[PDB]
Amino acid sequence: PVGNLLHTAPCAFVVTDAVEPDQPIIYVNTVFEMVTGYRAEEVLGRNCRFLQCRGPFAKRRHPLVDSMVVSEIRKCIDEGIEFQGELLNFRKDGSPLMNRLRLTPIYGDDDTITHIIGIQFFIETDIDLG
Amino acid sequence: PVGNLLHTAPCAFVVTDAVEPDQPIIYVNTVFEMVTGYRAEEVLGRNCRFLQCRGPFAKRRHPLVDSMVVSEIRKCIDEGIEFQGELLNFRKDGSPLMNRLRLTPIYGDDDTITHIIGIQFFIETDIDLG
Ligand SMILES: Cc1cc2nc3c(=O)[nH]c(=O)nc-3n(C[C@H](O)[C@H](O)[C@H](O)COP(=O)(O)O)c2cc1C
Ligand SMILES: Cc1cc2nc3c(=O)[nH]c(=O)nc-3n(C[C@H](O)[C@H](O)[C@H](O)COP(=O)(O)O)c2cc1C
């Protein structure tokens, strides 16, 4: 028996304020809410990096997140350009997702960057975690 | 013969400036480019309703697009609120697409709508046209 289908494309995305300190989340779409397990009120105003800790309670990023990719994200955000890579993330229930992630900055009335759009493509993964 | 595959999700979206008049396009991702046929230079600065017109040389929207839904969009934008609905549009090469469109607006530093994001889901249709 088939229902409770989704009508659109399953694309997950987030928007951040590139004006306030440290890219706070101002918008998540409900595909994000439904793949990650985090509701929008849980994540508004927070930086996206909680996805790199495994669970809602863990406060340090997981060892197997590639500290080099995360470094490159930081470069791109800072140099005002597009990031594109793949990075271990974690659902609220603990499960691992390879996040095939793309960051695109948006300019306002200026030549200043006012927002960044983030497009997650979470992929299931059988990474051994201990 | 298994090549030139998309690596992420076939997700299509567009961003416009809500400050300048008539919501001009400031960004389009390459899935939009690839589906609709319109290259990003062609469309930058223009308003999106050209998708309602069949081909790049048509001057008036095609009769078959529900002007009752076009009306609903204008209302939503004007009230600074989200829009959601389905709508006939056309590739550059003329073929018809049913566009399952979602419009979600974005706030800036002055709690005021600075951009709008439109996510397009372009479905093939066998509609008869003329
Ligand atoms: C708009 C946006 C979306 C992001 N989405 C994710 C994400 O889904 N998963 C993730 O691991 N990091 C994501 N990040 C990256 C972090 O927010 C952060 O910028 C990165 O972890 C580097 O900074 P840090 O080393 O100080 O943590 C996103 C960043 C931005 C700006
Ligand atoms: C961000 C954004 C994306 C839009 N994308 C589309 C689209 O893909 N297809 C479409 O037919 N209309 C789209 N529209 C709507 C038209 O651009 C226009 O706003 C609408 O036709 C209502 O105005 P009008 O009756 O004055 O033409 C979009 C609008 C916005 C703000």
Instruction: Supply the residue whose CA is at minimum distance from atom 5 of ligand 1.
Output: A48
Distance A75 CA to ligand 2 centre (A): 35
What's phi and psi for B118, nearest 5 deg? -120, 120
Distance B129 CA to ligand 1 centre (A): 46
Start-to-end CA span in chain A (Å): 37
Q: Which segments within chain A are labelled E, that is strand? A: 12-17, 25-28, 83-90, 96-107, 113-120, 122-124
Inter-CA distances, B13 with A95, B10, B35, Å: 29, 10, 11
Residue whose C-alpha is closest to residue A49's, from A30, A74, A68? A74
Pairwise CA distance, residues B17 & B51, whole Å: 18
Residue B115 · residue B105 · CB < 8 Å = yes
Contacts of A112 in chain B (CB under 8 A): none
Which experiment gave this structure? Answer: X-ray
Contacts of A117 in chain B (CB under 8 A): 15, 117
Pairwise CA distance, residues A17 & A105, whole Å: 10
Return the ligand 2 atom nearest residue B89 CA: 11
Inter-CA distances, A71 with A65, A75, A76, A78, B80, Å: 11, 7, 9, 11, 37
Residue A129 · residue A23 · CB < 8 Å = no
Q: What residues of chain B, 6 to 65, have a C-beta less than 8 Å from chain A?
A: 7-13, 15, 17, 19-20, 26-27, 29
A52 residue type, one letter: Q
Domains of chain A by residue range: 1-130
Structure tokens at B106: 């974005």
DSSP annotation string for chain B: ---S--SS---EEEEEESSSTT--EEEE-HHHHHHH---HHHHTTS-GGGGGSSSSS--S--TTS-HHHHHHHHHHHHTT--EEEEEEEE-TTS-EEEEEEEEEEEE-SSSSEEEEEEEEEEEE------
Measured from the Cβ of residue B67, the count of other Cβ atoms closer than 10 Å reads 11
- Collapsed DSSP state (helix, strand, coil) of residue A97: strand
